[PDB]
Design a protein around this ligand. Structure first.
Ligand SMILES: *[C@@H]1O[C@H](CO)[C@@H](O[C@@H]2O[C@H](CO)[C@@H](O[C@@H]3O[C@H](CO)[C@@H](O)[C@H](O[C@H]4O[C@H](CO)[C@@H](O)[C@H](O)[C@@H]4O)[C@@H]3O)[C@H](O)[C@H]2NC(C)=O)[C@H](O)[C@H]1NC(C)=O
Ligand SMILES: *[C@@H]1O[C@H](CO)[C@@H](O[C@@H]2O[C@H](CO)[C@@H](O)[C@H](O)[C@H]2NC(C)=O)[C@H](O)[C@H]1NC(C)=O
Lengths: 49, 49
C-alpha cells in the first residue's frame, strides 16, 4: 500500500502540472472566421474547422 | 463468530465507544483505510481486487 500511494502521489501531481500550464484562461473563445488579419496569415496556427 | 477485521474507537478513559466492520460494504473499508470516521469529499484509493 505504501507503493500505491507513492505512485498515486506522482500520478495526481503529474496531472496537476497539465492544468497549470494550459488552463490559464477562464473563457473559451471561438475561432474567428477571418484567418487573415491585415495581411498576416494565421492558417497554419489556428485549427481548420 | 467470524474471523474478520474490525476498527475500534477508544475514548480518553479506555472505553470502546464505536466500531466499524471493515468487510461490510465499500464505504466501510474506506473508513478503515484512512483511519477516520469522518471523511472529506474526494477520490480515495483503496485495496486491490
Ligand atoms: C495563407 O497561407 C496558406 C498556406 O498555408 C493558404 O492555405 C492554402 O492555400 C492554398 C492556395 O490558396 C489553398 O489551395 C486551394 O484549395 C482549393 C480547394 O479545392 C483547391 O482546389 C485549389 O487548387 C486549385 O488552384 C491551384 C492554384 O491556384 C492549383 O494548383 C490546383 O490544381 C487547383 O487548380 C487551391 O490550391 C488551400 O486550400 C489553403 N489551405 C487551406 C487549409 O484552406 C491560405 O490560402 C493563405 N491565406 C489566404 C487568405 O489566402
Ligand atoms: C472519563 O473519565 C473521567 C473521570 O476521570 C470523567 O470525567 C468526569 O465526568 C464527570 C461527569 O461527566 C464530571 O462531573 C467530572 O468533573 C469529570 N472529571 C474529570 C477529572 O474530568 C469523564 O466523564 C469520562 N469520559 C466520558 C466520555 O464519560
Amino acid at each position: 500500500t505504501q507503493l500505491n500511494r507513492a505512485l498515486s502521489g506522482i500520478a495526481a501531481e503529474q496531472d496537476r502540472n497539465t492544468r497549470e500550464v494550459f488552463a490559464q484562461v477562464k473563457q473559451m473563445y471561438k475561432t474567428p472566421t477571418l484567418k487573415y488579419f491585415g495581411g498576416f496569415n494565421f492558417s497554419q496556427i489556428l485549427p481548420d474547422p | 463468530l467470524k474471523p474478520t477485521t474490525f476498527m475500534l474507537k477508544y475514548d480518553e478513559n479506555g472505553t470502546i465507544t464505536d466500531a466499524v466492520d471493515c468487510s461490510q460494504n465499500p464505504l466501510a473499508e474506506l473508513k478503515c483505510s484512512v483511519k477516520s470516521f469522518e471523511i472529506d469529499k474526494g477520490i480515495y484509493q483503496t485495496s486491490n481486487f
